[PDB]
């Protein structure tokens, strides 16, 4: 009954949003035409969270699609689930950013934010009790990171007492897609720390590790990569849509999960991921879920928690599930791992259980983790940022849009202050 308004920005944000709306529609039994074709009654008890009513029992998603290049727009519309989105929700300009945060934030994205804020207000004021907003974008590009942070800074001023989740694809450690990526990522993280309630870091190299070692696939296309993260997003908010024995929505998690307002950078992970051959040799049981959940291989970011300390841990279980084994297993890992957990907070683990499992699966779980080990992601792109900035390179494409050179110095000084307060809370 507490609605969530979905926001997509950029090419990556629309390719991750198309698969996200495919897995939710399959979960609630919504066919690509728009009607409902299911077998249970609990699917329609809480469906207004993501869907709006229409004439004749048709359901439309509560999502907006923003991109400076309408090239990804046509691929989404021509897909298997492209006729379910509202045709007025597509917002698009004429010229792309071209992997430039300056163009996406100040020059090209400035005349499109007013046109898209009308549609955001139209979807938000039609909700009786709006829970909050949700944004899918990547820091890899110019319109996902450029006007994605512009939309964040206008939403926070208009709706201050709300919640807002960001699923940001932070740059890869080994091979990066963009040469000017340290400029786009440093200037966007600085915009994220004062204007976001919860942030999740998703790494493509971590997604490559899952599909190669844990899942044992040979052709991991981007559809298979986007299916893993869409399962995480549905599993985070499963207590809102489906009844359970211990319920926990987004505000319930973030209170237990964020000790200080500068500590909102999490790391997700999906528990029941098995290979084809390994399926015949494994029984799904509660210790098996909590053993694969805490594994550093399974986690969806390029930071090893063995090098750091677990600050706070969240777990959201699904399916008809016991309670003693749930409490026993996440106590045993805390007692065994005496050094990986901080000592000035007792019982770092927060528990939530949902009753309805995903289709074809008996049990499932989702992991949210706050660690000091995520600061090595920030240090890696900060040293690359300072390596490019000393020689004054690649930034005549930045100061030629009006931006001064003092913005980079304050963006790094905020970022070195951000890594320095992760260290003394370790």
């Amino acid at each position: 009954m507490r609605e969530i308004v979905h926001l997509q920005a950029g090419q990556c944000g629309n390719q991750i949003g198309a698969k996200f709306w495919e897995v939710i529609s399959d979960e609630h039994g919504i066919d690509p035409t728009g009607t409902y074709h299911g077998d249970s009654d609990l699917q329609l008890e809480r469906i207004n969270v993501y869907y709006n009513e229409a004439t004749g029992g048709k359901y439309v998603p509560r999502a907006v699609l923003v991109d400076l290049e309408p090239g990804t727009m046509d691929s989404v519309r021509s897909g298997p689930f492209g006729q379910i989105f509202r045709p007025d929700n597509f917002v698009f300009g004429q010229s792309g950013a071209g992997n430039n945060w300056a163009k996406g934030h100040y020059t090209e994205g400035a005349e499109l934010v007013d046109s898209v804020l009308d549609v955001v207000r139209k979807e938000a004021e039609s909700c009786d009790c709006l829970q909050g907003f949700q944004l899918t974008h990547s820091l890899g590009g110019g319109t996902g990171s450029g006007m994605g942070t512009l939309l964040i800074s206008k939403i926070r001023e208009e709706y201050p007492d709300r919640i807002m989740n960001t699923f940001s694809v932070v740059p890869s450690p080994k091979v990066s897609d963009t040469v000017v990526e340290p400029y786009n990522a440093t200037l966007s993280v600085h915009q994220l720390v004062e204007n976001t309630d919860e942030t999740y870091c998703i790494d493509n190299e971590a997604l490559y590790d899952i599909c190669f070692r844990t899942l044992k696939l040979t052709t991991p296309t981007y559809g298979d990569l986007n299916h893993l993260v869409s399962a995480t997003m549905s599993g985070v908010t499963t207590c809102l849509r489906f009844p359970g024995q211990l319920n926990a929505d987004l505000r319930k998690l973030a209170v237990n999960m964020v000790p200080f307002p500068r500590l909102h950078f999490f790391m997700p992970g999906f528990a029941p991921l098995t290979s084809r051959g390994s399926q015949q040799y494994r029984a799904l049981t509660v210790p098996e879920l909590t053993q694969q959940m805490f594994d550093a291989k399974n986690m969806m970011a390029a930071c090893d928690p063995r090098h750091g300390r677990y600050l706070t841990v969240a777990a959201v279980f699904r399916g008809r599930m016991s309670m003693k084994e749930v409490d026993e297993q996440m106590l045993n890992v805390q007692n065994k791992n005496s050094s990986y957990f901080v000592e000035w907070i007792p019982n770092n683990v927060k528990t939530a259980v949902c009753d309805i499992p995903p289709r074809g699966l008996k049990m499932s779980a989702t992991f949210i983790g706050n660690s000091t080990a995520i600061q090595e992601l920030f240090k890696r792109i900060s040293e690359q940022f300072t390596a490019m900035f000393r020689r004054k390179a690649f930034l005549h494409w930045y100061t030629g849009e009006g931006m001064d050179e003092m913005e980079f110095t304050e963006a790094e000084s905020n970022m070195n202050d951000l890594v320095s307060e992760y260290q003394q809370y370790q």
Binding site: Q94, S95, E111, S115, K392, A393, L395, H396, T399, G400, E401, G402, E405
Partner: protein, 116 residues
């Protein structure tokens, strides 16, 4: 002469939205409010009165043809970000050297941004 904004459908009537990729004539965003009637300043045939100030520009226009433009046309994208204090000075002097091209009806208008 002067364009006036529709103030809610102005996005529908901009230059690139109407498929015109050259730089634009300006648009009057704000409107001044007068008071009372207006004094009349011209003759019956259209001559200006002897007492009204007159601009000193060309009464026919400031269009500049093919054979009248400077031989070394300054560029339209000028950023002095990573250049030396002598090279950037040479570029801005080359920009300043021809005032006729800047104020013309065609009018290549460079935007000098940054510091050396």
């Amino acid at each position: 002469a002067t364009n006036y904004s529709a103030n809610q459908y102005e996005k529908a009537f901009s230059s690139k939205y109407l498929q015109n990729w050259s730089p634009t004539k300006p648009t009057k965003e704000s409107i001044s409010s007068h008071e009372g009637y207006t004094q009349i300043i011209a003759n019956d045939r259209g001559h200006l009165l002897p007492s009204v100030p007159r601009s000193k520009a060309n009464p026919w226009g400031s269009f500049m043809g093919t054979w009248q433009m400077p031989l070394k046309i300054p560029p339209a994208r000028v950023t002095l970000t990573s250049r030396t204090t002598a090279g950037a000075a040479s570029l801005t002097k080359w920009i300043q050297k021809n005032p006729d091209l800047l104020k013309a009806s065609n009018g290549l208008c460079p935007e000098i941004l940054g510091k050396p």
